[PDB]
């Protein structure tokens, strides 16, 4: 139909998506969004919807979770990051479900990644691989694992959550997580074990 109709449909869909991302998915109708998604892609305008999706998602991430992570980099930095990841995942579940139907027609003809993969990629680019968050996360994980190796016990389930989050963030396998996590960890472990070996060879014997 006219461009005004599709613009209004997209505008309300964007408002509904933003409302869902604001932890207000209770009072919102699913059939209306599915029907509007049906009539939006039916008119062969999936490129505009996909482009609008990416802009809305990245704008929400930069506004909400980018500020939140930087604001609490010292007060439960890893706990807040896991909570934001869980909030992003549970919000993207309904976002993907509506747009997986869009994906069925889109990715099989346009040959692009799915919306769930798109959300993981943009989250990796804007949160984990940030110019300041990446180094801060690397430094704090090395510090706590070194303190754990020293002899005192710290939280261990959170690290398992963090590595699992990074593994899911890889989205293809063990390409991103392995380089981001192991490479600083191998260097830290190499020096720690080398210094430990040097101390042990002089303070003890082969017994």
């Amino acid at each position: 139909m006219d461009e005004k109709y599709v613009n209004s449909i997209w505008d309300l869909l964007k408002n509904a998506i933003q409302e869902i991302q604001r932890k207000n998915n209770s009072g919102l109708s699913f059939e209306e969004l599915y029907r509007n998604a049906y009539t939006m892609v039916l008119h062969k305008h999936g490129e505009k919807l996909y482009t609008g999706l990416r802009e809305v998602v990245t704008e929400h991430l930069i506004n909400k979770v980018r500020e939140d992570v930087l604001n609490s980099l010292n007060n439960n930095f890893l706990q807040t990051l896991n909570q934001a990841w869980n909030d992003h995942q549970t919000a993207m579940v309904m976002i993907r479900d509506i747009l997986m139907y869009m994906d069925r027609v889109y990715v099989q003809q346009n040959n692009v990644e799915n919306v769930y993969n798109l959300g993981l990629i943009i989250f990796r680019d804007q949160v984990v691989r940030y110019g300041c968050i990446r180094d801060h996360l690397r430094q704090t994980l090395l510090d706590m694992i070194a303190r754990e190796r020293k002899g005192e016990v710290v939280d261990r389930g959170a690290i398992r959550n963090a590595c699992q989050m990074l593994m899911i963030l890889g989205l293809e396998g063990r390409s991103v997580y392995e380089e981001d996590f192991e490479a600083p960890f191998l260097e830290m472990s190499a020096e720690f074990f080398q210094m430990e070996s040097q101390k042990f060879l002089a303070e003890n014997s082969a017994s």
Binding site: L28, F30, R35, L42, M100
Partner: protein, 564 residues
């Protein structure tokens, strides 16, 4: 392990019983005031939308009443029962809405079943409707299957009303494609012109694009001032625009203008001894022998027919059963003039061996052909409907005949046997006695040229020719073909270049077969040497090979590599 069959049906019938008897119902579908008590289990087993409707965590996850909108009650009921009993009753009318709800509910299995049905149902009268349907919903396999069938069938008809209501992108793909089958490049021009003039100035912006896909041999001649007449007033952004616009876009002739009158041969002698037979063709103009696709599953003992619309069909035949071993099958196939492949069609009711395929009034008539029945009506004459894609029986022939040939003259079926002839009247479905021949000859072929029947040869064969006139109803002799003595010519009657020519292969004593064709003078009653087929291009074909008149594209086909 494979999961048990016996427990599967026992549970399956319990799925149906619990549905027809409304007991374990927790969710009900509210559609236009119609109650659909069902289960969350079965609905999302087939549908990929109900799994995102129930196991999503939305308000509907707890709500037991959903108002499903923009759906049909009949389509939902057949989909629901298909999820419950597995039976998908697909008619010829509701498949359109069946696909609409299947895509809406994202139900994969019914989508494949209805897509396959639409692949079988594609034809001339719904090609435009299905292509637009294949454009509305992304069904690329059907879209490509339609587009190929669409491309040929538009050019033939180009008068259907649904062609006007088409998207701009679809028309650009259709017109700019190199698969159109047209005798001239002007019929596509006027087809575009009438489409542009079908509506108001909403076609003005698409006109700068539709002409950008048509060749420039008509973008400077007539049908440029006609648009100026239909131009919106005082618009100076179009008349000057098209004045200096038709410089680029590389004039090149299309592919549809390459249908030369060629002699299609079937069951020819296979060059490689690994295969039994092959199919070749002779080019009366190119003087070359182009290869053809093998008959479907090496279908031997078949018959050929070419409709006035230049379409090739194959009926009857036998396949070697899995040393002599052959089983007769009633499979039917259609030849693709561009893809060089045989598309399967609706099979016949009875199997045939060497059937006489004759086209008349758009119906394909197969007369006789050594049917399997052998009852009192051991003829089994039956026509084929190219409109509904089905076979309908016709009036049985008065007498049982073997090794017979049939032609069509004056919208009537003329079948010839050893000495008798009967004419079939399609309007009343009756047979009338015709003239009697004075010579007992069989194993011959006849070609219908104008309003006369030319029975050439008969018994090897000979040079006896008996000409029959429909308006006169009499058999008369004309002459005998001058051939080398002590030989066994293989006569083949065919009509080519608006003249009666003969494809006669002769073999001398202890000599190889020689190929030569002659042109029979209708008024002078004499066979004149039209062309001599050199043996450097055409090799031996055999004895049980058939010949027919038709048009084929040398570009799509490939030359057969074989030594002279």
């Amino acid at each position: 392990r494979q999961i048990n069959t016996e427990y599967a049906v026992s549970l399956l019938e319990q799925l149906k019983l619990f549905y027809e008897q409304q007991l374990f119902t927790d969710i009900v579908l509210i559609v236009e005031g119609t109650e659909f008590p069902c289960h969350k289990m079965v609905l999302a087993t087939c549908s990929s939308y109900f799994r995102a409707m129930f196991m999503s965590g939305l308000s509907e996850s707890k709500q037991t009443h959903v108002h499903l909108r923009n759906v049909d009650a009949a389509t939902l009921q057949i989909i629901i029962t298909y999820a419950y009993t597995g039976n998908l009753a697909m008619n010829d009318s509701t498949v359109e809405q069946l696909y609409e709800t299947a895509c809406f509910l994202q139900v994969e299995d019914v989508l494949q079943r209805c897509r396959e049905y639409l692949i079988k149902k594609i034809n001339a009268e719904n090609c435009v409707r299905l292509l637009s349907f294949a454009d509305l919903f992304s069904c690329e396999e059907l879209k490509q299957s339609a587009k190929r069938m669409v491309e040929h069938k538009f050019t033939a008809v180009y008068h259907q009303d649904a062609f006007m209501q088409l998207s701009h992108d679809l028309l650009i793909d259709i017109l700019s494609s190199d698969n159109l089958n047209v005798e001239k490049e002007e019929t596509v021009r006027e087809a575009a012109m009438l489409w542009l003039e079908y509506n108001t100035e909403s076609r003005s912006q698409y006109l700068s694009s539709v002409l950008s896909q048509i060749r420039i041999d008509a973008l400077s001649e007539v049908t440029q001032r006609a648009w100026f007449q239909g131009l919106p007033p005082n618009d100076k952004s179009v008349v000057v625009q098209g004045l200096y616009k038709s410089m680029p876009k590389f004039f090149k002739p299309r592919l549809g203008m390459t249908k030369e009158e060629m002699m299609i041969f079937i069951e020819a002698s296979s060059e490689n001894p690994c295969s039994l037979y092959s199919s070749v063709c002779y080019s009366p103009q190119a003087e070359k022998v182009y290869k053809l696709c093998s008959p479907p599953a090496d279908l031997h003992k078949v018959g050929t027919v070419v409709t006035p619309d230049n379409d090739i069909y194959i009926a009857g035949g036998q396949v070697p059963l899995k040393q002599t071993a052959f089983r007769t099958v009633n499979c039917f196939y259609w030849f693709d003039a561009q893809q060089n492949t045989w598309f399967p069609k609706t099979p016949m009711l009875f199997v045939r061996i060497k059937p006489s395929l004759v086209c008349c009034e758009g119906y394909i008539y197969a007369i006789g052909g050594d049917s399997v029945g052998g009852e009192l009506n051991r003829r089994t004459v039956e026509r084929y409907d190219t409109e509904k894609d089905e076979w309908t029986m016709v009036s049985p022939l008065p007498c049982a005949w073997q090794w017979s040939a049939a032609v069509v003259v004056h919208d009537c079926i003329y079948v010839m046997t050893l000495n008798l002839m009967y004419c079939y009247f399609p309007r009343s479905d009756s047979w009338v006695e015709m003239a009697m021949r004075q010579t007992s000859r069989s194993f011959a072929s006849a070609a219908a040229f104008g309003d006369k029947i030319f029975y050439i040869g008969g018994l090897g064969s000979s040079v006896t020719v008996e000409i029959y006139d429909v308006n006169k109803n009499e058999w008369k002799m004309a002459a005998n073909i001058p051939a080398k003595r002590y030989s066994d010519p293989c006569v083949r009657a065919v009509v080519i270049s608006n003249s009666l020519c003969v494809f006669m292969r002769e073999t001398h004593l202890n000599e190889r077969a020689k190929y030569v064709t002659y042109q029979y003078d209708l008024e002078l009653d004499r066979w004149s040497l039209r062309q001599h087929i050199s043996e450097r291009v055409l090799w031996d074909l055999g004895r049980d090979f058939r010949c027919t008149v038709g048009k084929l594209y040398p570009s799509c086909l490939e030359e057969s590599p074989w030594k002279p």
